[PDB]
Design a binder for this molecule. Structure first.
Ligand SMILES: Cc1cc2nc3c(=O)[nH]c(=O)nc-3n(C[C@H](O)[C@H](O)[C@H](O)COP(=O)(O)OP(=O)(O)OC[C@H]3O[C@@H](n4cnc5c(N)ncnc54)[C@H](O)[C@@H]3O)c2cc1C
Ligand SMILES: Cc1cc2nc3c(=O)[nH]c(=O)nc-3n(C[C@H](O)[C@H](O)[C@H](O)COP(=O)(O)OP(=O)(O)OC[C@H]3O[C@@H](n4cnc5c(N)ncnc54)[C@H](O)[C@@H]3O)c2cc1C
Lengths: 456, 456
């Protein structure tokens, strides 16, 4: 590197630098997808927006390929690079909540659990993903969905402004009143337009949530999935119900004869009055025989921290995903036949139903595509042993292929390292064209290309 | 304020200053105990250790009364002052976790749920309090106990070093090998010796936790509290079992006829294998008839997020607490007599059993007193209506006095605003004297006196 350039970086940088020789280098460069093993030239742990400014500008002048890291959960491995710089936001974790204004201002490196802890100090919340240690940054920039989404929308449907550092080092505010073209693009366009150092969200009062998790035997799979698909077509916004087909975890609530066998783990909640919730959940828990039933009245923060049963983080993952407009009987039989071949205790075949308030937002209103498709299937393979990569990767590949005709589009935040080419078909032609024009305005040199990338 | 010393402050202070004419002043000056209404001259939202140094020194030079604020949970109201400065740490929220080294380094403004989210990304944890939005800062400096304490000790029992800003403006590292007199005092001595900007903890692997919560009618109070007291005297460290006497919350798992009436809310968990946990919890769940039983196998992050049933944060509080070396049958009847007179649905009469690993640490190894007293009673009054302060305060006051023959010592972190006199009783003569000598060395002018104060 150039001494003078690096020294100008060091003169403006207040964060922490991790070099390949430093003690923590090997752990700092690991991301959630362990199949991604890469060695950056430098890890820049920023602690402020001026730190990001200095890091972006240093990267530009130095020609270092830029990775940006929030929570490290990229299913494509985007938050680490070979030979470049990781602009690592993990220390920018602050959240300021106004109870009176039902507002949260959160830094671009927050984990979901930090954000939910801060809003719930005032019994407030806003939609985000279901696993606490996911990063707010990548999740929100891709759109963001979870337990609160049928009632309150995607994360981006509650976003009111961002602070963002663009490729030329400038700092912008983007909102409905200021740079609205950029504000449109960051609501679903990924890290393509710069590093978001602060997000501002509208919040909602969310008291205790009635919640249930239970497991159905695979021989009752047909009636259970068909009951789910039929019920969610007309369900009220307050009800959320998701199916996770997986090997049953060896938990005392489950009969021993089911441990390790494929099952349907059904999780549901009611966002609203808990007594109504209990009535609503009891009315959907008995499409099959509920094994291992857990019912609770939870603070929202505890609902957020619940997923997933077993509380084990896999080392290695591979995902294939898409949306469905309908879940046909043939699609259902295919889901069931492939779930019966799950071989790792960490793998799940996920069936999610969105719709509700997500679908009421006009498709043109944000960069997020596929609001009118209520079904999401995620073949989320996950395992420990690197010698088993091919066996678990094949499971997700063949399940996807056996479903592919029924699938449309794709969530950019469930893309795997090999799906750089699914970008156009994920956004659709109109959105992709609009994204490209924003990119030419704000990142014409494509300095930010470790993402589901939109070339200028 | 002399313009010179202020102008210096701003050249070195990279954080956010809030002044009394600013719109966000009223909200920024509120703390969890809403009975505390104070107007500081300045709120300084620090964002880094250099920010804290600048604020401390500015407050020293300017002669301003110093309040330090982590999570804002001081039951005595210490984290806001009239006419002084608030060194507010809430934006200093970052945590670095090493999975391999089982280490967490957390900034001094962290909330517990942010810390637990970060450690649980790796299936690790270390003891802390039971409500997610409490600050790590004030909790750890007083000792810190919760669900993991019977297995792994107080928070301070897993603390391996701090970075601290002393009253002269200096930055120090204190550990078992570097300034160990200071390290002893900060492990239980509160904010008396300076502002801790980073805490380093040893972590533990904590997988899924079998957990139960249930409610017993006061009709069965005697047999239930006696079973608890007898069982806990010889229980393994892995069992934690606490009683919360309260009005039953209006939740659907409870019969409506019980809503609003005094009950015993018993919460229990097993830190270890969940199949053993299920066997052990069933062994302690039927000393009376359990109502509204919830049993679940939870990730530790969700157990942390669970307390307390109802998910209500009160506006106004008043606490009286102490330790017990024994809970007689007589004491049990008094507790029950006073619990029957609970008025607010947010008040709890808490009966905790510590012991286990907390008691195996030698008394003199930290500044935390009363390790050998296994019982804690906390008369935790909590309510909303500011015209009702006197009736709820009286319940707590009179309940404490009626148990005065059984109660000794006191946790510094449960003291109320009028308990500045309890400090010697709490620490005991010996510990108090040693603390004064560390105080004479490190804060000889008592710049940090908004705490359970140890004069030098
Ligand atoms: C276990 C698990 C559970 C999940 N659950 C859900 C769920 O319930 N709902 C859901 O919608 N998604 C969910 N996701 C997907 C998640 O939205 C994506 O993995 C997302 O990219 C994670 O963001 P991150 O910051 O953790 O990832 P990173 O790998 O840090 O970043 C992801 C991408 O965003 C960019 N980026 C991150 N932060 C910023 C920033 N501040 N500014 C600019 N660019 C940024 C990176 O450069 C990269 O392109 C889950 C993922 C995992 C692994
Ligand atoms: C709802 C609730 C639940 C609780 N549960 C538990 C529990 O399960 N276990 C338990 O042990 N305690 C518990 N507590 C008590 C808690 O430990 C004390 O209230 C503690 O002082 C709170 O710390 P804080 O940073 O949130 O408070 P603050 O009001 O911000 O600070 C309290 C004291 O610590 C000082 N201080 C705070 N941070 C720092 C720092 N970084 N450096 C120096 N001084 C600092 C302040 O000056 C002050 O004297 C609970 C409290 C509440 C209100």
């Amino acid at each position: 590197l150039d001494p003078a350039t690096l020294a100008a970086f060091s003169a403006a940088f207040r964060g922490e630098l991790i070099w390949p020789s430093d003690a923590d280098y090997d752990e700092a460069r690991r991301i959630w997808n362990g199949t991604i093993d890469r060695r950056p030239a430098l890890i820049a742990r920023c602690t402020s927006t001026p730190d990001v400014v200095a890091a972006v500008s240093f990267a530009r002048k130095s020609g270092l390929l830029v990775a940006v890291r929030g929570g490290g959960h990229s299913m494509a491995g985007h938050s680490v690079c070979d030979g470049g710089i990781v602009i690592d936001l993990s220390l920018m974790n602050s959240i300021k909540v106004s109870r009176r204004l039902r507002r949260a201002r959160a830094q671009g490196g927050c984990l979901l659990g930090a954000f939910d802890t801060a809003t719930q100090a005032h019994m407030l919340a806003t939609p985000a993903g279901v696993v606490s240690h996911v990063g707010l940054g990548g999740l929100v920039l891709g759109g963001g969905f979870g337990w609160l989404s049928r009632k309150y929308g995607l994360s981006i449907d509650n976003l009111t402004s961002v602070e963002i550092v663009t490729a030329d080092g400038g700092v912008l505010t983007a909102s409905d009143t200021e740079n609205p073209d950029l504000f449109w693009a960051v609501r679903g366009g990924g890290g393509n337009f710069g590093v978001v150092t602060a997000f501002e969200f509208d919040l909602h009062r969310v008291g205790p949530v009635r919640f249930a998790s239970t497991y159905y035997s695979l021989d009752e799979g047909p009636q259970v999935i068909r009951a789910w698909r039929d019920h969610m077509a007309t369900a009220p916004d307050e009800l959320t119900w998701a199916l996770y087909l997986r090997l049953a975890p060896p938990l005392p609530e489950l009969p021993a004869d089911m441990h390790g066998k494929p099952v349907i783990c059904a999780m549901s909640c009611w966002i609203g009055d808990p007594h109504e919730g209990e009535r609503q959940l009891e009315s959907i828990l008995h499409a099959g025989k509920p094994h291992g039933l857990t019912k609770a009245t939870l603070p929202y923060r505890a609902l957020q921290a619940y997923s997933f049963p077993g509380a084990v983080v896999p080392d290695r993952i591979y995902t294939k995903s898409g949306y469905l407009n309908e879940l046909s009987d043939e699609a259902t039989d295919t889901v069931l036949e492939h779930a019966a071949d799950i071989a790792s205790p960490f793998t799940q075949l996920e069936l999610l139903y969105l719709g509700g308030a997500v679908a009421r937002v006009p498709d043109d209103a944000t960069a997020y595509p596929n609001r009118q498709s209520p079904f999401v299937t995620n073949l989320a393979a996950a395992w420990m042993d690197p010698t088993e990569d091919a066996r678990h990767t094949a499971w997700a590949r063949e399940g996807y292929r056996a479903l592919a005709g029924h699938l449309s589009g794709g969530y950019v935040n469930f893309m795997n390292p090999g799906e750089a080419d699914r970008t156009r078909e994920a956004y659709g032609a109109a959105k992709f064209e609009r994204l490209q024009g924003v990119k030419a305005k704000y990142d014409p040199t494509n300095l930010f290309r470790l993402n589901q990338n939109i070339p200028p």
